[PDB]
Structure 1
Amino acid sequence: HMSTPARRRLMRDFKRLQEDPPAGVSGAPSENNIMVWNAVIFGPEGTPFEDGTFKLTIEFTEEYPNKPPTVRFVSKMFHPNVYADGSICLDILQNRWSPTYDVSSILTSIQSLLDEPNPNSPANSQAAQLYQENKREYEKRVSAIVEQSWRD
């Protein structure tokens, strides 16, 4: 759509993602609603999430880009900063959002978060406990959800 500054900016976000995506990310507006996007993030290489293909949804309001969207994993996730319902604790989504961030930088930020959990936001208490105390078992759990992410 093109009727509002938020919509035109989202279309520019979409253009950047089509023609120049960061490694391992994709996103597109939903067919009927430019405010709701579907996105995919590949787990970062050299991390337990490598080979994962994780679907997410992103919901915008007309305040975008001055207010961050809400982002949720749709794929099953096992990560200290991700709630059971897919909600994500990411500082640029909660505390230091900037209108200069776009869909691309949100997706790469979540990607980076997969590699480096924030110890301040233990949304998944078992994931934070294993990450803190038992990396082998943490990665076994992540491997499970990597394999599950190959199934919608």
Structure 2
Amino acid sequence: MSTPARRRLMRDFKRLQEDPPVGVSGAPSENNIMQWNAVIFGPEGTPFEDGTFKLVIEFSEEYPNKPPTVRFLSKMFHPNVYADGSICLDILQNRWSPTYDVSSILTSIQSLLDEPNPNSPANSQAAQLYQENKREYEKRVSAIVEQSWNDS
């Protein structure tokens, strides 16, 4: 049966694919469509600049009516980001609105690496090591960005 959800996401896809952003991409799964797979690099000047990170966008049938949740498929270290591979971002909670598009969703997560949101220390460890052991932070980011290159 025709599903309006499915139709919306395939339109959104077509829009993103005719009008693509830079330093992020996103596409659906191969067979599933409630689950998209998306990618980000660090912008210039970040400790992440070379390294590439892999995400999934998790949608609902009441879409974009509910916030599209996001997961991190790859290991991620950031104070806004769970070990559980999820994103605390305030617009992805009660502050969402059906105005943000697939580019907008991803470009936020890119700039979030350059500028974390200290109003929400999701994993107090990451925020702790920022104030405490910034040199360990620098180590871990080189290591986590390095893990990107595990296929060569």
Aligned ranges for residues 46-65 of structure 1 at < 5 Å?
Answer: 46-65=45-64
2: CA distance, partners of 1:100 / 1:77: 27
- 1:44-67 per-position Cα deviation (integer Å, ceiling 9, x unaligned): 221111112111011101111111
Give the TM-score of the pair, scaled to structure 2. Answer: 0.89
- 1:80-129 per-position Cα deviation (integer Å, ceiling 9, x unaligned): 01110111101110131110112211111111111111112222222211
Residues 79 and 33 of structure 1: CA distance in aligned 2, closer, same or farther (over 3 Å)? same
- Contact residue 78 and residue 124 of structure 1 kept, 8 A: no
Structure 2 counterpart SS, 1:27: strand
Q: Which moved more, 1:2-11 or 1:83-92?
A: 2-11
1: CA distance, partners of 2:52 / 2:65: 29
Cα offset, 1:130, TM superposition: 2.2
Structure 2 counterpart SS, 1:80: coil
Count, aligned residues: 151
Q: Which moved more, 1:3-12 or 1:142-151?
A: 3-12
- Contact residue 58 and residue 69 of structure 1 kept, 8 A: yes
Q: Which moved more, 1:136-145 or 1:75-84?
A: 136-145
- Contact residue 39 and residue 58 of structure 1 kept, 8 A: yes
Unaligned runs of 5+ in 1: none
Query: RMSD in angstroms over aligned alpha carbons?
Result: 1.8
- 1:9-59 per-position Cα deviation (integer Å, ceiling 9, x unaligned): 211221232232211111111111111101111122211111121110111
Residues 60 and 141 of structure 1: CA distance in aligned 2, closer, same or farther (over 3 Å)? same
2: CA distance, partners of 1:83 / 1:25: 20
2: CA distance, partners of 1:77 / 1:143: 12
- Contact residue 13 and residue 104 of structure 1 kept, 8 A: no
Cα offset, 1:134, TM superposition: 4.1
Give the TM-score of the pair, scaled to structure 1. Answer: 0.89
- Contact residue 130 and residue 138 of structure 1 kept, 8 A: yes
Structure 2 counterpart SS, 1:38: strand
- Over the matched positions of the two proteins, sequence identity in percent amounts to 96
Unaligned runs of 5+ in 2: none
